[PDB]
């Protein structure tokens, strides 16, 4: 049972010493998921992110299994990719690409993004979603916190532990999975749902880019769930500040009718993306976010 | 140097032997060990109070426990600075957690009443001192080999995902309201349901769904309400009132008739024996 799922996790990870391939371990953060380090590939110089986890103390090992399996099977330039993993006794070490630009959350909460920068971020995220959905993977937890940026402005999606794999005989899910403020109404109300819930969450992330927060953030998560179920498509504070094409893009992401809501493939053709600036335009925002997050300290 | 007032001067490596690791937490590493002069088993938590955020709260918490001991709270013994590590020494309760008993035995109402009474005595003590425990649940109730029942301590982001289910939390907690001591009475009611049903409520629910159910239904639905006596069901109703003013206080519930069917605490030691056999 519980020992069974533990041995199932252990069987998919090679037994070895992470110190033979990686060096320069330096701690950058601690979560309930474990300790996160940066490190360096000793042969190539690649900087990597390594999370250290005590399996004896992980609550939901089945989730770790799913995330590792999904990452191994779905590599893509717009995803924070899995590199390697190691079993060290009762410790699991997971090696991922390292994104030195920080999270999109730091940018949206500390800067003003123009529509060309927002369009660039949206296009990179839609490229990841088109790839994932074409492979029957639904992320279900899209938010700025799970978008990481490279020092060159690259944009990549991370944190797949809430994801779902759909199949022909089970092409929809029904569970209230996600982070409340970003969840689509059909998820909040426990209706059958599919990949377009990620498109809804992307729409909420575009509201983050415009306003600095998802709708209802000042409310408790349960109250926010109630507001999503009862309001449906959220209101912008100042819609008149948006271009006509940006408003149309938002409307298509946040459509209540799932049939009418855009697919990732469809939204990659939207006129709004054609005003996208090059990804280098994001590096001044990264610099501002880093400065701001050292002055809040 | 308030630390010096709470730190004994001896060498704990001389005073204790047979160190055995039994867990790793965010607060530090917990070992079992034995007093070399008396044979008492102890639990020792090792924490590097080396600029760990908000060390003063950890320090003051220790100060509070030394001055405010209680028969139904795990007794604090001593603490030592061992190379800028703080070792906190507690009595060890070798009967294990209530969780192991609940999952490996079926408790009868007399055994449940006894556990509830002992926990209510601890809560009356804490509440009289304006302490809210906030985590009354089966893995924080420890059992002695004589059937003693004790709480392990005083209780010590909107943007983040919920991974586990806070099944013990009162509705006023989950709705992020200001709350008081009676949230512990709610959690006790949930634990009594756990004891009679063998598992915590909401086990098959997603955390967000369980949060909504707690906020709106309040009490979880009993799986088999017909199996509970009238007096036990009334006790549960008094613990699980949604109206905070109507919910019983610890002092009030210590007078409830359900507690008067309590078996002697010795009746718990066969449960401990079963749990150890089942988990070994
Ligand atoms: C912002 C600094 N740059 C950065 N660049 C990459 C990562 C990768 C990761 C990561 C993701 C996933 C797993 N995986 C995959 C299998 C199970 C598992 O845990 C992992 F090990 C790791 Cl290290 C991570 O956490 N962080 C910390 C910040 O993350 C924000 C979202 N929480 C990262 N930060
Ligand atoms: C069931 C095995 N028996 C047992 N018998 C006693 C304890 C005492 C303790 C403890 C309590 C409190 C502090 N204190 C007091 C001041 C700050 C602090 O940390 C402490 F250090 C320690 Cl060691 C502890 O942890 N555990 C591990 C299991 O606990 C379950 C709940 N998590 C114990 N197990």
UniProtKB/Swiss-Prot annotation, chain A:
Active-site residues annotated for this sequence: 141 (proton acceptor)
Keywords assigned: Acetylation, Allosteric enzyme, Apoptosis, ATP-binding, Cell junction, Cell membrane, Cell projection, Chromosome, Cytoplasm, Cytoskeleton, Disease variant, Epilepsy, Exocytosis, Intellectual disability, Kinase, Membrane, Nucleotide-binding, Nucleus, Phosphoprotein, Serine/threonine-protein kinase, Transferase
Positions with a binding annotation for ATP: 28-36, 51, 97-99
Paired cysteines (S-S): none
Domain of life per record: Eukaryota
Cofactor: Mg(2+)
GO-annotated cellular components: actin filament; axon; cell-cell junction; centrosome; chromosome; cytoplasm; cytosol; dendrite
Sequence positions bearing Phosphothreonine: 175
EC identifiers of the protein: 2.7.11.1
A biological process from GO: actin cytoskeleton organization
One function term, GO molecular function aspect: identical protein binding
Modified residues (Phosphotyrosine): 37
Entry comment on modification after translation: Autophosphorylated in trans, meaning that in a dimer, one kinase molecule phosphorylates the other one. Phosphorylated by JAK2 in response to PRL; this increases PAK1 kinase activity.
Tissue specificity statement from the Swiss-Prot or TrEMBL entry: Overexpressed in gastric cancer cells and tissues (at protein level).
Activity regulation, free text: Activated by binding small G proteins.
UniProt feature coiled coil, ranges: none
Catalytic activity: L-seryl-[protein] + ATP = O-phospho-L-seryl-[protein] + ADP + H(+); L-threonyl-[protein] + ATP = O-phospho-L-threonyl-[protein] + ADP + H(+)
Major localization class: cytoplasm
Places the protein is found: Cytoplasm; Cell junction, Focal adhesion; Cell projection, Lamellipodium; Cell membrane
Residue stretches making up the Protein kinase domain: 22-273
Disease named in the record: Intellectual developmental disorder with macrocephaly, seizures, and speech delay: An autosomal dominant neurodevelopmental disorder characterized by impaired intellectual development, poor speech, postnatal macrocephaly, and seizures.
Family: Belongs to the protein kinase superfamily. STE Ser/Thr protein kinase family. STE20 subfamily.
Purpose of the protein: Protein kinase involved in intracellular signaling pathways downstream of integrins and receptor-type kinases that plays an important role in cytoskeleton dynamics, in cell adhesion, migration, proliferation, apoptosis, mitosis, and in vesicle-mediated transport processes. Can directly phosphorylate BAD and protects cells against apoptosis. Activated by interaction with CDC42 and RAC1. Functions as a GTPase effector that links the Rho-related GTPases CDC42 and RAC1 to the JNK MAP kinase pathway. Phosphorylates and activates MAP2K1, and thereby mediates activation of downstream MAP kinases.
Subunit structure: Homodimer; homodimerization results in autoinhibition. Active as monomer. Interacts with GIT1. Component of cytoplasmic complexes, which also contains PXN, ARHGEF7 and GIT1. Interacts with NISCH. Interacts with DVL1; mediates the formation of a DVL1, MUSK and PAK1 ternary complex involved in AChR clustering. Binds to the caspase-cleaved p110 isoform of CDC2L1 and CDC2L2, p110C, but not the full-length proteins. Interacts with ARHGEF7. Interacts tightly with GTP-bound but not GDP-bound CDC42/P21 and RAC1. Interacts with SCRIB. Interacts with PDPK1. Interacts (via kinase domain) with RAF1.
Name of the molecule in the record: Serine/threonine-protein kinase PAK 1
Organism: Homo sapiens (Human)
Name of encoding gene: PAK1
Boundaries of the shown chain within the full protein: 249 to 545 of 545
